[PDB]
Amino acid sequence: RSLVIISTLDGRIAALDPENHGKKQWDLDVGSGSLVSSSLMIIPSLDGALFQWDQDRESMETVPFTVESLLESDVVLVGGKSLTTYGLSAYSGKVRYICSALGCRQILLLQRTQKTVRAVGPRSGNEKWNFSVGHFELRYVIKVSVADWKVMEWEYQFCTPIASAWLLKDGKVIPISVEAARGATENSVYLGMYRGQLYLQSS
Amino acid sequence: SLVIISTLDGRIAALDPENHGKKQWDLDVGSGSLVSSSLKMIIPSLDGALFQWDQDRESMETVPFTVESLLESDDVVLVGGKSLTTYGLSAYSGKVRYICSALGCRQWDSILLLQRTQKTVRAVGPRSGNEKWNFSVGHFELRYIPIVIKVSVADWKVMAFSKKGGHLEWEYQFCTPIASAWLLKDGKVIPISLFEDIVEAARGATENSVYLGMYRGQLYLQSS
Amino acid sequence: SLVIISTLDGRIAALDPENHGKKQWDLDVGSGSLVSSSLKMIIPSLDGALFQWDQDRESMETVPFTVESLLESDDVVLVGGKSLTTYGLSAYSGKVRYICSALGCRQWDILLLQRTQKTVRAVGPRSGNEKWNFSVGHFELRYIPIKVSVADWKVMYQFCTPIASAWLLKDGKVIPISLEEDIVEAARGATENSVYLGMYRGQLYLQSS
Amino acid sequence: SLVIISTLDGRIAALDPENHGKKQWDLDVGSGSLVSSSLKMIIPSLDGALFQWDQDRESMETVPFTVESLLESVVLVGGKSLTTYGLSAYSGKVRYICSALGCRQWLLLQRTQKTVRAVGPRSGNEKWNFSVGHFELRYIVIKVSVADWKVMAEWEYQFCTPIASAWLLKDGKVIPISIVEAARGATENSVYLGMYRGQLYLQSSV
Secondary structure, three states, X not given: OEXXXXXXXXXXXXXXXXXXXXXXXXXXXXXXXXXEEEOOOEEEXXXXXXXXXXXXXXXXXXXXXXXXXXXXXXXXXXXXXXEEEEEEOOOOOOOOOEEOOOOOEOOEEEEEEEEEEEEEOOOOOOEEEEEEEEEEEEEOOOOEEOOOOEEOOOOEEOOOOEEEEEEEEOOOOEEOOOOHHHHHOOOOOEEEEEOOEEEEEOO | OOEEEEEOOOOEEEXXXXXXXXXXXXXXXXXXXXXXXXXXXXXXXXXXXXXXXXXXXXXXXXXOOEHHHHOOOOOOEEOEEEEEEEOOEOOOOOOEOEOEOOOOOOEOOOOEEEEEEEEEEEEEOOOOOOOOEEEEEEEEEEEEOOOEEEOOOOOOEEEEEOOOOOOEEEEEEOOOOEEEEEEOOOOOOEEOOOOOOOOOHHXXXXXXXXXXXXXXXXXXXXXO | OOEEEEEOOOOEEEEOHHHOOOOOOOOOOOOOOOOEOOOOEEEEEOOOEEEEEOOOOOOEEEEEEEHHHHHOOOOOEEEEOOEEEEEEEOOOOOOOOEEEOOOOOEEOOOEEEEEEEXXXXXXOXXXXXXXXXXXXXXXXXXXXXXXXXXXXXXXXXXXXOOEEXXXXXXXXXXXXXXXXXXXXXXXXXXXXXXXXXXXXXXXXXXXOO | OOEEEEEOOOEEEEEOOOOOOOOOEOOEOOOOOOEEEOOOEEEEEOOOEEEEEOOOOOOEEEEXXXXXXXXXXXXXXEOOEEEEEEEEOOOEEEEEEEOOOOEEOOOEEEEEEEEEEEEOOOOOOEEEEEEEEEEEEEOOOOEEEOOEEEEEOOOEEEOOOXXXXXXXXXXXXXXXXXXXXXXXXXXXXXXXXXXXOXXXXXXXXX
16 A cells, blocks of 8 residues: 655646556646746746846856745735645545635645745736745655656656655655765756746755 | 724724814725634734733743744644735725735726735644634735824724824724724825833833734734 | 852852752853943843834834844944853852853863853944944753742842843752733733843843743 | 955965966964864755765755754754954955954954854763854955866966855956756756865855
């Protein structure tokens, strides 16, 4: 009795099998939408930290603002960290509950965090740039490749790109991904694209 | 050039200190109360950081958390969330010229923009979504872009005195407690405050500048 | 057994309560004194906050600053250093066994005393004239195997220099010491029971809970 | 028109009076070095965030504490400092020094520094440390290849130990120097993994 849970870059989850399989068990869709969004050159992390790239430099800087710090504010800023948990049945994946910030409706608990920020014209009310960044964490060799959106012997090639991924077995929930240290740093970092817009991924 | 006020029902109100204080066309937006507790007994400030008060121990002792914290924390799962939003009002008078939450920017057509922050946190236990306790603080903020007015709390009356002979010119009374209050004359929004011969002159100031009221049964407290 | 008194001139003193008050050891770290502050007027709490007083509006205003908060910052540059060192002691009698800090550890050939100290100075070029300061110190207690006041700098031994923290030892447990609309007043009673504004050698200062 | 190099031995230096390249003065201030580790390896930032890599894995994971979040907690000791050294743009020679202990007398080089020890509770013995710091300054053909511990220009000046920041003065300004696939390129070149003396450390931008 074990699983693989795959949080993907479209705000979706999936249960596959490590039982000769890889076969899709259950496959969840919530009302929250994308996992990374940006009208926006500034590249958001899932974190969601904020970074500046201009191709004149190598300079990929972190900037002194995060999608968080910007909410506690010429241009008036709005947004909202969410925190809603589900509420699932390890296999079948049918929500027992979904209990949000402003609501609650009655053994595998899938919590969505989603931070946004918009910037609108003060007179105008209409936004000029925005950011929505979210992610999934849960509680009660499975190698992922991230540029080749795959769990890997069976293999399940996803599209869209993979965000979090947990194998659940026995004791459950453990995720997947001098010179040698100089070598071990660049695999910590990954840039993806969805669909659409650039993003970072973290370690 | 007038005096906006917010309160603990959540609503907002603007007056008219030149026309003897009389409210002029005043509505608002739903989000519930400005404090909703549901938990010897902890007390929420509207800032979001809260205090236990052991009524035996008379122990208004600052419990090492906030409403913000718990959301970035076993027995119960801490759901919740903060929300900021802007109700740009052509008021005087009305006049929802737009609204902007994380869920869109529905506009309007036809100069006072109005912030609304809300900090809830339900705690529910994981076997089923049963709700074990929750706090939801909040507060509007004020910004405008193109007598002597006081709002001491206790009674819920905003009052205009004068600089001349310090007499009361007019006074307006309120139903729920004043949360905040701002005068809007000339343009620059002015916030009315709702608060060894010095060692008590300056002690006076310190017990002056905490208000421990209660609204809709809820025990909450303010300060500066 | 004994009672420990962190007092506001950086000192410690141990009395035992089952003997009228007889002292015993009494620690005088080198670190000086607790609140110091080149000060209508800006008042720090101990621990670290800063509070603006205006005698016009007669309110005690909050400032958007902390002594730490200012180190992570015009014409004036900011200086300081949050320090925090622990002193091992013997519980009785005396006596510093080991000591300290960010800058080394000495053990000399059961009751562990931690000092914290936040500074901020404000200097500005060309020549660096310090225009003001704020230093707030601190103390916490621990250990390995009676009604203090606050207004009178007094215990049940009458102290000289105001008190800041104190504590009990018993069956090995540093236990600290404290310094209808009818129910509201009783809570409304405890909110002005929390904050204390004092005076120590010039600087006016705050304490609360 | 100067060039300034703060290096991992707690010393700064000023080289190149626009034509020469000759270092016109070089002050050192304690503590000593810009990075300590003592010392499953856990490697600090100059910041210092804390990271753990295991060669059993291929990944560099970051840890949930920084040299500061743990200062507010093994008994842990430590302290962030901020000391400023005032000297005149050229020749050096310190005019003021304002640390946490008062000002002394008679272009401003601002050093920040976090340290943390871990000692035994009952016995004041130790058990790891972390001291990390770095330099800032303002007032009143430049290039570094940090892995080759030198500035270049014509000419080049190799330092020991590796150099960390590099501010150039010219006029009245202090300027520093350090498809998706090409963006993929700007991140493996954003971080640098170093060594001193002795111990490993991390860097950003770079």
